[PDB]
Amino acid sequence: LVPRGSHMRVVLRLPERKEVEVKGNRPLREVLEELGLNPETVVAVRGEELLTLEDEVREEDTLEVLSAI
């Protein structure tokens, strides 16, 4: 139950908007892999920061992943 699970919030704008929830507390690389997204075709944004594949994303963060294509 994800409303009670309340994993980290991810906004897919590829380019159309979509909100999903995936587990955080792991490198961005993993969550991008889980979402079936190619890291070379997206830019992950948190707040006002671009994230790299090694960067750690927590359960409370909100990621905006923008399609570069």
């Binding site: 671009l50 923008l66 294509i69």
Partner: protein, 309 residues
């Protein structure tokens, strides 16, 4: 971790073995663009250059960079008349130009020729993608010639160029097209940059761009092409550049190819036929518009067009 200064990097580029923080990435990006320019002698230092700007991430980033490099970069936007999308792209481009000191030119398809791209497509018998590109190429060249610009710059990047090359090879040109009489030079300063790198620059620079794509190109073949090339890039950093450079350096120079250009009968711009593709397209459109009461029978359209502001 950034290479130069040691702050946390915000862009990691495996294909270059390079990681940079915001500040030094922005500086690197502006410098690499100038390197691509010098390498092909795309622009003479500080000269006038007409930039094609749709408000997209690529064209706005390009306008910014050319501006910061001391070029006289004047934007040219074409209102294609595709509903709310065209309206939003106009506003973003306008806003971009006014928030800086940049001179903007605008050509509105409907106000000029009577029809927008989709209606243009339906009447002409062309795919909307085809009619759009043809209109874009003809008009930006027309403005360049009329306003005395030597060169037009477009924001095409590596993914774009590699996808076009790939599509050619799958279903069987370059960074610089030379200047010809009645035909401005066409250059692509971003052709060594991936889409991710350009978008990263746009975000870090703070540029507000039109995120939504053109409604017509929803399932384009180029998307399929880009996805396959990027699937490779994921596991092989630098493949797209090796691919494009390989064609320009090793294949095309060894490639045997096959016609002189003529002044169009109507508008007088270079073409191989009696009448160029553009006037060939609008002649049909008007003829069928008149024939279907979509246009008054006693009207005539002058080929030449004036850009405003």
């Amino acid at each position: 971790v950034c290479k130069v200064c040691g702050q946390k990097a915000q862009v990691e580029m495996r294909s270059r073995g390079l990681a940079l923080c915001r500040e030094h990435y922005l500086d690197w990006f502006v410098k690499e663009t100038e390197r691509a320019i010098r390498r092909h002698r795309m622009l003479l230092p500080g000269e006038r250059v007409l930039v094609a700007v749709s408000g997209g991430k690529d064209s706005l980033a390009l306008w910014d960079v050319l501006s910061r490099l001391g070029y006289q970069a004047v934007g040219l936007h074409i209102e294609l008349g595709i509903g709310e999308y065209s309206k939003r792209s106009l506003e973003v481009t306008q806003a971009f130009a006014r928030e800086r000191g940049l001179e903007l030119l605008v050509v509105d398809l409907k106000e000029a020729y009577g029809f927008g791209v989709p209606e243009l497509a339906r009447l002409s018998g062309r795919v909307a993608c085809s009619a759009c590109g043809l209109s874009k190429r003809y008009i930006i060249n027309q403005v360049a010639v009329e306003e005395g610009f030597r060169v037009v710059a477009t924001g095409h990047n590596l993914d774009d160029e590699a996808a076009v090359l790939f599509g050619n090879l799958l279903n069987p040109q370059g960074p610089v097209l030379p200047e010809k009489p009645g035909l401005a030079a066409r250059v692509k300063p971003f052709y060594r940059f991936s889409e991710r790198e350009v978008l990263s620059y746009t975000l870090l620079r703070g540029i507000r761009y039109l995120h939504e794509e053109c409604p017509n190109a929803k399932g384009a073949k180029s998307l399929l092409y880009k996805e396959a090339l990027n699937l490779v890039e994921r596991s092989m950093p630098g493949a797209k550049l090796r691919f494009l450079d390989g064609f320009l350096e090793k294949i095309r120079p060894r490639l045997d190819v096959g016609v002189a250009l003529r002044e169009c009968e109507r508008c007088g711009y270079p073409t191989t036929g009696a009448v160029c593709a553009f006037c060939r397209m609008w002649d049909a459109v008007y003829r069928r518009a008149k024939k279907r009461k979509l246009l008054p029978e006693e009207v005539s359209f002058r080929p030449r067009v004036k850009p405003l502001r």
